[PDB]
Every structure is written in structure tokens, then in C-alpha cells.
Amino acid sequence: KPKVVLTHWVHPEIIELLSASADVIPNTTRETLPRSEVIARAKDADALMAFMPDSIDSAFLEECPKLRVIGAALKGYDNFDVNACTRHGVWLTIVPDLLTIPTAELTIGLLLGLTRHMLEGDRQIRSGHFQGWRPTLYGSGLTGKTLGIRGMGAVGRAIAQRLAGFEMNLLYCDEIPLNAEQEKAWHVQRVTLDELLEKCDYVVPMVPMAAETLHLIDATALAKMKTGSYLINACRGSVVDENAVIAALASGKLAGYAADVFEMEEWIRADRPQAIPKALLDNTAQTFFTPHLGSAVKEVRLEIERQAAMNIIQALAGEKPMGAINQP
Amino acid sequence: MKPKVVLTHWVHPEIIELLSASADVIPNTTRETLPRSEVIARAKDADALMAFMPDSIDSAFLEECPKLRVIGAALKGYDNFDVNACTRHGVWLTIVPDLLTIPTAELTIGLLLGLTRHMLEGDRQIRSGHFQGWRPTLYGSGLTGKTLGIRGMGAVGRAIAQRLAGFEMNLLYCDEIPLNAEQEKAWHVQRVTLDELLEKCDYVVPMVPMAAETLHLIDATALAKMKTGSYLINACRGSVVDENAVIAALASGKLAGYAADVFEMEEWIRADRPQAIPKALLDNTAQTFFTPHLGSAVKEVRLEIERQAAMNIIQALAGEKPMGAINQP
């Protein structure tokens, strides 16, 4: 009977589901196991469920010569050597379209919490000094203001759809435009990038790479934005220069910065910092942060785990896994 | 008394005999989709249900079927089931393996030949009783020497490339993950970017796998990049083609023809869904060719899908964990 290693905690139903066709080595804790321990568990495994902090490379795959399938519970595969997985006869599978909506909804939450000073607000209530309304924490509203979605991939369309009823002025830029049916329905108007930066009170960078590279909201892009604008990054840690944000925050150019992702997460880069800049951590007045909760919805995580499990079950049964992106 | 199985769509007699060994079978004797109210009337006290693509199993449905123990879906996916609701109600939810690869590829090639050789118009001329010999009409477009491109090289895309390999074409493909060097050589299929594929191909075949899907891969921007008089074939998913953009390109002459086995109409999970196929496509009998989702309409395949769905139901009713379970109730 084959053996499947799960690197991170999954719901008990996923373990029962996998158990009929394999012996399951689960992570009973909610912490990331070190790479040495993951390799030790998977050394004689036939299947592995990988998560975001997993980095499958040539070294990993040669330590695990019995690996037949890696069911990744992820949308992207930037920490997998896909061709090496092919080299080693390992099915590599992903899970699409499940992370789009909860990332769009958390992006909107990030916008409201930052523009309405909801964090400072909660600090005022817990302090125990609340004795009624005060002329404090005046923020910026949504209606009548201009929001720009740079990049109109899956998540951007889900944000535009949800912001359509907020009576905003919605701008977007993308090399590929939406059609007039979509543009009219979400009342979203296409512009260029320089136009987006100049006119927008809120900027939301959001497209999975196509014509772009890294650090695209940089000091140059920040110099083009409206003074007192806001930037919301729930996309990827690499698209925003965090030191440029610190400077723009201090110069007054930016009024706020909210983020679900950080530069320290990009283990694929060598210019990677190893912490979130203290200047951003100390600025509770102008920042709003969450620890990569873009898909941290109980119901969604369960369906993400289920899809990874079914890929593993299918590959172990000799079928082609539904989520496969390669061919061993 | 035996447990009761409700089958929401027609199955082959051999499947009803198979199920009837272990259960009382309430079949659909017609080739029609029953209204949801009628399905709930039959499954109100059913122990098992065989679901198909037009079925939508939600929490409201399960509350009206308290005796349900297993739903044997005759599908490869489960996008139309509330899986967690099935688990909380103690209902096994099962699927079947993907058996649609080869019969879809064969139908896409059928779509390509029928469209490019005016075979529909041709049949219409014969049926009119006016045929009395060869005539210089219905001059269409050939395969040999022309360039065909497959956007997305999944299982279906490979099945098509393998089959077209003998047609002496210039095959192009674009995909994030490259084909094996061995298959690139065997099928003489050459890898290019998306922009090069649209610029050079006489025939464009969007065939995206499940793991690489996005919306409107063939849109106004893509059509504007394509060669004038090119042909588009869509037997993948409706959402990958912007049908209204297709209509414009057919009108402007940019597109010479469009063949489809799938339609945006079918995506009840997307919100920008229309409820009918556009009339401008239905009326354009000279430049189109459609079939009503016949991608896997092959008897031996349909039978095997039914057989495996029935096996899951039979196993689950016997107290076993069904072979195709996707949950643990």
C-alpha cells in the first residue's frame, strides 16, 4: 500500500479520504515543518501534497525516488521544477480557479479597513476609553472616488464585479482588454498605465504575470500617483517595492498601504529581504496587513485540499490527474 | 425490499439490469432533462441518486431527500455539487474517471473537416433534389500544407496532434509546459508563442486543460491578430471563445468560419452567461457548424461512464467505500 505525505495540516476528512488508497503521513501541527523533516518523511513516499512553503527541486526529487505524484494545493507553481518532475517521472498537479474569489473579497476588505481607519478604530474601543462619537479617524470613502485595477486577470474581474455597485469611478489597464459587455456591466473604463497612476485615489495591482517582471510599483510609479492615494497589494509580494512605499508614506505621497503579501515570501529571488521592514510594521496608523489570508476561508481550503487529494488518488490509480500540468 | 435508486437521465438498459440486482431503479425513460421539482419528487425517499451534468445538488436539494445515502455522479468533475453539504448530510459523493479525451479529439477533427469543406451546405444541396452533377461551387479550404495551431496542449490537444500528424500539415502549439521532445518529433508539432500562433495559423484550435483555464482566450484582440479568412474550432469549453467577437469577425471577413461543440450558454457557474446561442450564429449556416455537446456522445464511452457511476452506487449501498468517492460523509 502506497504512502502519501502531507506537508501541512489538512482537515480530518481529507485524511480519511486519502486513507482508503494510501497510508497517510499528516502534519498534525499548524506549523511549517523544516525542509529536512519533510524530506525525511517523503523519502519513501509515493505521493506528496505540497503547499506554498514547499520547494520541490532536483535535490528534493532525488531524495524521494518513489515519488509518483505531487498534488500541490496551490494555484501557482513557482517553487516547482516542473521539467525535473517530468525528468523523475512525477505527476505535477495544481488547483485552479478556487483562490480567485476569496482573494478578491479580502482585497476589498483590505481597502475598507485601510481607508476607514478600522484598525486604529478597534484600538480605540479596546483601550476602554470610548465614551461616544468624536471628530476622530476621518477617512476616505468609496463612492465618488477613483479606483484603478492594474491588470484584469481572474482576480481583477472578480474585484471589478464586486466594486461595480459602489458608485465609484472604476479604471483598469491591461494589454488585453475586457469586452464592451463586461466594461458596461461593471462600469469599468480602460485607460493606460500612466493614466491609471495619475487619476486614481486607490491603486490595486493585480495580474498574474504576462508582460511585467518584478518591483513594478516602484519609486517611479509612486512618483506618478496622486498625493494622498492608497495602494492595496493582495497579488504577489514582488509587484511592490516596499522600501519605495516607506519613502512615499513618509513623503506624504501615499496616505496608506495595505498588503496580504510581502517581499520576504519570494524565495525564488536573491534580492529577497528576510523580514517585513520595521518601518512598515511600526506604522499602524497608515498600514493594514494580513499574513497571506487571500484564500484563508475554511470552506475554500477544504475544497483546495480535496482537489489535491483527488489528483493524488487518481495518479496512484493509474489515471491522468485532473489538475496535471505536466506529463511524466 | 431493495433500496431505491433514482436516475435523472436516460441510461442504457444494461445499466438498469445491473443496478436492479441490488435496488429498485426509478429510471428516466426519456431523453429529456426533468424539472428539479420532478427529480425531488422521485428522490424524496430515494436511497441513491445518479446525477448528470444538468443536475445541481445544493443544500436545499439535500434537505428534501433525507434518505439519500449516495450520489453517483456520471461525471468527471463535481462543479455542480455542494460537496460539503453532501458530507454534512451523510451522502457519499462519487465521480468517474475522465474518459472524454479521445472522442472529443475525434469530434474536433470532424468539426474542422465539415466546416472547411462546406459539408453542411453540401448535404442541403443534395437533399433539395436539384443535384444533377459536379459544379464549380462549395470550393472550400484544405488541410495539406496549411498551418494549424493548438492553444493549450493537454490530453485532448495531444490526442488531436497525434491524429492530425498524418495529414501533412504544419502543426503549431503554444503552452506553458512544453511537450516531450519525442512527441514533438513524432507529431512534427513545433512550439511557438501565442502571438506567433495567431499570426501564422490558418486553423486555430483552443484546447485548454482544466488546470490552465482562463476566460475569453479567443477574443476581439486575438481575432484581430489572426490571418484573414482563418477558421476557429471550439470543442473545449464555451467560455474560452468570445462568441460576440466571433460574430463581428465573421461579418468583417476576418473569420471565414466557426465550428463549435460548446457554448457560453452552458456556463451556469459564470455570471456573464447568456441563455441562448446568438441568433447571428444560428442563422449563419454558410460559415458555421455546430453540434449539441456531442464531444463524448459515443455509446461505448457513455456506457462505461454509466457503468462506473452505477458501481459506485452499488458499492455505497452495500456498506463499502465507493471507488470514486470524493468525500467522507
For A62-81, give the DSSP string: HH-TT--EEEE-SS--TTB-
Q: Are B274 and B246 in contact (CB under 8 A)?
A: no
No. of H helices and E strands in chain A? 13, 12
A40-44 contact pairs (CB < 8 A, 24+): A41/A5, A42/A5, A42/A67, A44/A3
Other Cβ atoms closer than 10 A to A21: 20
Supply A170's cell numbers.
472604476
- Euclidean distance between CA atoms A141 and B42, whole angstroms: 53
CB contact under 8 A, B211 and A93: yes
Helix (H) or strand (E) holding A183: helix A180-185
3-state DSSP assignment of residue A309: helix
A296 close to A98: Cβ distance less than 8 angstroms:
no
Type and span of the H or E element at A259: strand A254-259
Q: Do B131 and B269 fall within a single domain? A: yes
Q: Please indicate, yes or no, whether residues B271 and B328 belong to a single structural domain of this protein.
A: no
Instruction: Judge if B196 and B90 occupy the same domain.
Output: no
One-letter amino acid identity for B90? G
Closest partner CB to A326 (pick from B76, B177, B219): B177
Compute the C-alpha angle B122/B125/B131, nearest 5°: 115
Measured between beta carbons, which residues in chain B are less than 8 angstroms from residue A323?
Answer: 210-211
| Cell 468560419 -> residue | B257
Question: Helix B13-20 crosses helix B299-317 at what angle (to 10 degrees)?
Answer: 10
SS (H, E, C) chain B: CCCEEEECCCCCHHHHHHHHCCCEEECCCCCCCCCHHHHHHHHCCCCEEEECCCCCECHHHHHCCCCCCEEEECCCCCCCECHHHHHHCCCEEECCCCCCHHHHHHHHHHHHHHHHCCHHHHHHHHHCCCCCCCCCCCCCCCCCCCEEEEECCCHHHHHHHHHHHHHCCEEEEECCCCCCHHHHHHCCEEECCHHHHHHHCCEEEECCCHHHCCCCCECHHHHHHCCCCEEEEECCCHHHECHHHHHHHHHHCCEEEEEECCCHHHCCCCCCCCCCCCHHHHHCCCCEEECCCCCCCCHHHHHHHHHHHHHHHHHHHCCCCCCCECCCC
Neighbour tally for A39: CB within 10 Å: 15
Please tell me the distance from the alpha carbon of residue B253 to that of residue B201, in angstroms, as a whole number: 16
Which residues of chain A have a Cβ shorter than 8 Å from any chain B Cβ? 13, 16-17, 20, 82-83, 86, 93-97, 153-154, 157, 161, 176-177, 179, 181-182, 185, 299, 302-303, 306, 310, 314, 317, 319-320, 322-327
Residues paired with residue A162 on neighbouring β-strands, in sequence order: none
C-alpha count within 13 angstroms, C-beta hemisphere, residue B91: 29
Cα–chain center distance at A164: 22
DSSP A189-251: EE--HHHHHHH-SEEEE---SSS--S--B-HHHHHHSPTTEEEEE-S-GGGB-HHHHHHHHHH
> B13-16: long-range contacts at Cβ-Cβ below 8 A with a sequence spacing of 24 or more?
B14/B303, B15/B303, B15/B306, B15/B307, B15/B310
In angstroms, the CA A295 to CA A248 distance is 29
Q: Are residues B222 and B75 in the same domain?
A: no
Distance (Å, rounded) from C-alpha B242 to C-alpha B258? Answer: 12
> How many A×B Cβ pairs under 8 Å?
70
Q: Are residues B132 and B54 in the same domain?
A: no
- A8 in catalytic set: no
User: How wide is the angle at C-alpha A193 spanned by C-alphas A187 and A198, nearest 5°?
Assistant: 85
Give Cα separations from A269 to A238, A274, B166 (angstroms): 9, 11, 45
B138: left (phi over 0), alpha (psi -120 to 50) or beta: left
What gap in Å lies between CA A326 and CA A320, rounded to an integer? 10
B228 CA to centre of own chain: 28
Q: Print the domain residue range for B105.
A: 98-295
Distance of CA A234 to the CA centre of its chain: 6
Pair A18, A116 in one domain: no
Is residue A71 within 8 Å of A309, Cβ to Cβ? yes
Q: Is the dihedral of CA A137, A142, A145, A147 positive or negative?
A: positive
User: Distance between CA atoms of A269 and A263, rounded to whole angstroms?
Assistant: 9
Cell of A44: 519513501
Kindly name the residue from A162, A265, A266, A269 that is annotated as catalytic.
A265
Query: Quick one: A243 and A115 in the same domain?
Result: yes
Instruction: Please answer whether residues A194 and A210 qualify as being in contact, where contact means their C-beta atoms are separated by less than 8 angstroms.
Output: no
Q: Which amino acid is at A233?
A: N
The CA-atom distances, in angstroms, between B206 and each of A2, B88, B175, B232, B286 are: 37, 39, 11, 8, 22
Q: What angle do CA A158, A163, A165 make, to 5 degrees?
A: 125
- Side-chain-facing half-sphere of B71: CA atoms under 13 Å: 31
The answer to whether A308 and A5 have CB atoms below 8 angstroms apart is: no
What's the sign of the alpha-carbon dihedral A38, A43, A48, A52?
A: positive
Task: Output the nine-digit C-alpha cell for A204.
Answer: 490595486
Distance CA B222, CA A176 (A): 9
CATH number for position A238: 3.40.50.720
Q: Are B217 and B151 in contact (CB under 8 A)?
A: yes
Q: What CA–CA distances, in Å, run from A196 to A107, A149, A174, A249, A257? A: 18, 8, 11, 19, 17
Tally of structural domains, chain A: 2
Which segments of A83-208 are extended strands (E)?
91-93, 146-150, 169-173, 188-190, 202-205
Pairing of the two strands A202-205 and A146-150: parallel
Tell which of A173, A322, A326 to mutate to test the B interface (max B CBs under 10 Å): A322
As a whole number of angstroms, the distance between CA B189 and CA B170 comes to 7
B12 with B118, same domain?
Answer: no
Q: Do A17 and B245 touch (CB under 8 A)?
A: no
For residue A78, the distance in angstroms to the closest alpha carbon of chain B comes to 12
The answer on A125 and A172 residing in a single domain is yes
Question: Which of B82, B210, B267, B326 to mutate: most A Cβ within 10 Å?
Answer: B210
Give the phi and the psi of residue A146 in degrees, each rounded to 5. -115, 120
Exposed (0-12), middle (13-18) or buried (19+): which is A70, by Cβ within 10 Å?
A: buried
Shortest CA gap B24–chain A (Å): 29
Q: Measured in whole angstroms, how far is the alpha carbon of residue B7 from the centre of its chain?
A: 21
Cell of A215: 518591483
Are B185 and B272 in the same domain?
A: yes
Can A236 be counted among the known catalytic residues?
Answer: yes
C-alpha cell at B286: 454558410
B312 and B265 in one domain? Answer: no
Cell of B258: 466557426
Distance CA A305, CA A76 (A): 15
- A131 CB burial (10 A radius; 0-12, 13-18, 19+): exposed
H or E element at residue A289: strand A287-289
Single-letter amino acid code for the residue at B134: W
| Residues of chain B in Cβ contact (below 8 Å) with chain A | 76-77, 83-84, 87, 97-98, 155, 176-177, 179-180, 209-216, 219-221, 242, 244-245, 271-272, 321, 325-328
For the record, the C-alpha cell of B42 comes out as 422521485
Residue type, A219: A
Alpha-carbon separation of residue A52 from A32, A75, A129 (angstroms): 10, 9, 42
**Contact (CB<8Å) B221/A16:** no
CB pair distance less than 8 Å for B244 and A181: yes
Does A222 share its domain with A118?
yes
For residue A256, the cross-strand partners are A230
